[PDB]
Amino acid sequence: CGQLRPSMMQHLLRRLVFDVPLLNEHAKMPLKLLTNHYERCWKYYCLPGGWGNFGAASEEELHLSRKLFWGIFDALSQKKYEQELFKLALPCLSAVAGALPPDYMESNYVSMMEKQSSMVDTSNITIPEKLEYFINKYAEHSHDKWSMDKLANGWIYGEIYSDSSKIQPLMKPYKLLSEKEKEIYRWPIKESLKTMLAWGWRIERTREGDSMALYNAAHGYSPRAIDMSNVTLSRDLHAMAEMMAENYHNIWAKKKKLELESKGGGNHPLLVPYDTLTAKEKAKDREKAQDIFKFLQISGYVVSLSAASRPLCTGGHASNKEKEMVTSLFCKLGVLVRHLGQTLDARTVMKTGLDSVKSALRAFLDNAAEDLEKTMENLKQGQFTHTRSQPKGVTQIINYTTVALLPMLDKHNVYSIYNTRSSRERAALSLPANVEDVCPNIPSLEKLMTEIIELAESGIRYTQMPYMMEVVLPMLCSYMSRWWEHGPENHPERAEMCCTALNSEHMNTLKIIYNNLGIDEGFSQPIINKVKPQLLKTHFLPLMEKLKKKAAMVVSEEDHLKAEARGDMSEAELLILDEFTTLARDLYAFYPLLIRFVDYNRAKWLKEPNPYWSKSHNFKREEQNFVVQNEINNMSFLITDTKSKMSKAAISDQERKKMKRKGDRYSMQTSLIVAALKRLLPIGLNICAPGDQELIALAKNRFSLKDTEEEVRDIILGIANVLFHLEQKSKY
């Protein structure tokens, strides 16, 4: 269980260091891998001190298994109880120190990154003038135990050595020892202190001294039995005790090894040396390997502050040193970007900083008060330095991760790099107004790309609280809010895959009274006065409601843009003004009823409109007619099924997509509303159950349904129409 498990990996380590034959270390490796993760959790303290020493030594690519043990410990050594990383932070530093030259062949280097996210020969000694009295006091406390052993038997003081009287020449008091036998006591002590003192371990001392004199035959001699049933252990007590025990028994064991070295490679069973000695043959040696250490430890001996972030805080260190090294390295080497370890460490520290911890919010949640602000600011500023540049390392998606750390929005008085990024985006923040070759970064191919719109959508996202300055709601945010809003037609240029992919962000101040008071504001902010943004943000809701058409495919982006400022997404004065929550949301719900249901408008143009009791019955009747059309279609397909690949499979896939999107927008809150209506009223229950039954009858089962649902799930697994029917039956 815990006898000699951990030393087998040490055996295999010593074999792996010198494995001359090939096709041998690769088989020794699984015996290291799987033996650890088979029974036990807490065995990874005696072993990986060697792994720490070897990580400090080098990072050899033949020895990639040494990194792979850490790269599986990152997931599997974390069993149920979630412990700390000081002794794991130190190999991160050494792994950085090894990372500096090469950093190109990724198969080994992945082990060194995510460790922080989810978490003897002796030459000569110059001994001091203090260590001469431990040996004189050794017999003072061990002759008590020798007499305690011997007084149980027949040995006792007498006159001269004789077998009848049962005397020995030893049995005098602990000072009056004869010179004919003197070194038998004091031989096996000082050859243990060499391993400590030569390398530099410590034998420091208190100012207390005699402690166990209080804490428990000529001369009045009787022994003082030091207690054996109480002991505790730590890193230094383990290191000291294991070291001295290794010194005694492995000195003796090296003599046995030299016997075999002279024998010439024998093979006979009765031999074990210390360093992988099982504990069964250990108790005799351990009764005095520890009791000498009892005499050393509690006889008046010891051996060995504002916890700031960089000073002591391990939770802070991974953020602090990483962000400092990043802002020193790549912020300086951005000039090196635009015209060995430069690009290598650049691409290393890129993802070591973007994903130092995958929970970018949690690492900056409560790890420390001010460090989240400074580190998020350094990350955002470093991203803003290289946001324009077109190197190969992509970080547009991880910029969303760094931006999600902000609302999970500190005080931006420490630095205005957020305003710097706001100005960098304000070069072409109004997308269709300024769409040209003079677009963001003034690029043709540098920063003008598809990642800019997605970074505007997700990276510009403060949903927890818009508690920033927002002083540029009259000037900078007003520019992208107004120049967009100059016309209902979005007016996108070429490569306009989605004009709504700028974002869904707009609200009442988040031409206008704030910017009209330009000299006054430039602190009468636009968010303070709610009537002025609510007037000219909400006036064009009647425009988009008036804008419609019988042909649904024409007005694709009519509902999408109107829904962002229309419904309850406009949190600014949504509870204050009932118009934004009630009437605008009713218009934004009623427009998809006429728009999305039409077969002219394909599902692609209105794929993901992520954003009412009056409209609930309308959607119920319309979806009942739509499922009836799908069921008549299914009856047509069953009767003389034509080539499904041409239009039938695509038609069924589009019908399933539309029905599933309607069912999901129902499942948000309208399904619960319809269930409450069904439980309350039988007429509403029968109305919801009729169309639902017409849907479930056609959507009972189909091979084309299975294939199209698998395609929809792989692109975006059919919709759970059975679950909706069960909810409606629980209502009815």
Distance between CA atoms of 652 and 709, rounded to whole angstroms? 10
Give the pair of three-digit tokens for residue 128: 């001091």
Q: DSSP assignment of 321-375, as one string?
A: HHHHHHHHHHHHHHHHH---HHHHHHHHHHHHHHTSSS-HHHHTTSS-TTHHHHH
Q: Which two tokens stand for residue 235?
A: 């890193």
Cβ-based neighbours of 34, under 8 Å, separated by 6 or more? none
Q: 26 and 65 in contact (C-beta within 8 Å)?
A: no
Residue 478 DSSP SS3: helix
What span, in angstroms and rounded, lies between the C-alpha atoms of 645 and 108?
Answer: 46
Q: What is the DSSP string of 567-608?
A: STT--TTTTT-HIIIIIHHHHHHHHHHHHTTSSSS-TTTTS-
Diameter of the chain measured on Cα atoms: 127
**Cα–Cα distance, 431 to 439 (Å, whole number):** 8
Cβ of 698: how many Cβ atoms within 10 Å? 21
- Under a CB-based contact definition with an 8 Å cutoff, are residues 95 and 59 in contact? yes
Radius of gyration of the chain (CA): 39
- Cα separation, 155 vs 573, in Å, equals 98
Cα–Cα distance, 402 to 455 (Å, whole number): 11
> How far is 453 from 399, CA to CA, in rounded Å?
13
Contact 87, 47 (CB under 8 A): no
State how far the Cα of 422 lies from the Cα of 434, in Å rounded to an integer.
Answer: 16
Q: Which residues contact 567 (CB under 8 A, 6 or more apart)?
A: 580, 581, 584, 585, 588, 589, 611
Name residue, tokens 């992509």.
394
**Beta carbons of 674 and 728 less than 8 angstroms apart:** yes
Q: Which two tokens stand for residue 363?
A: 């690492």
- Pair 112, 345: CB distance under 8 Å: no
d(CA 204, CA 367) in angstroms, rounded, equals 36
Q: What are φ and ψ of residue 84, in 5° steps?
A: -95, 180
Say how many C-beta atoms besides its own lie within 10 A of residue 699's C-beta: 25
Residue of 76, 6, 81, 10 whose CA lies nearest to 44: 6
Is the separation of the CB atoms in 731 and 675 below 8 Å? yes
Tokens representing 517 are 């008071």
Residue with tokens 């010439």: 264
d(CA 421, CA 340): 31
Structure resolution in Å?
5.1
- 483 and 443 Cβ atoms separated by less than 8 Å: no
Q: State both tokens at 422.
A: 């706001």
For 407, residues 6+ apart whose C-beta sits below 8 A from its C-beta are 361, 461, 462, 463, 464, 465
Distance between CA atoms of residues 614 and 89, nearest Å: 60
The experimental technique used to determine this model is cryo-EM
Cβ burial, residue 517 (10 Å; 0-12/13-18/19+): middle
> What's at 136, amino acid-wise?
N
C-alpha to C-alpha distance for 89 and 474, rounded to whole angstroms: 48
CB 611 within 8 A of CB 567: yes
Encoded amino acid at 312, one letter: L
Q: What's the DSSP call for residue 647?
A: I
Query: Three-class SS string for 78-122?
Result: CCCCCCCCHHHHHHHHHHHHHHCCCCCCHHHHHHHCCCCCCCCCC
Q: Is 455 exposed, middle or buried (0-12, 13-18, 19+ CB in 10 A)?
A: buried
Per DSSP, the three-state class of 180 is coil
* Helix, strand, coil percentages for the chain (3-state, nearest 5): 55, 0, 45
How far apart, in whole angstroms, are the C-alpha atoms of residue 411 and residue 299?
A: 55
Residue 253 CA to residue 120 CA, distance in Å, equals 13
* Other residues' Cβ atoms within 10 Å of the Cβ of residue 578: 11
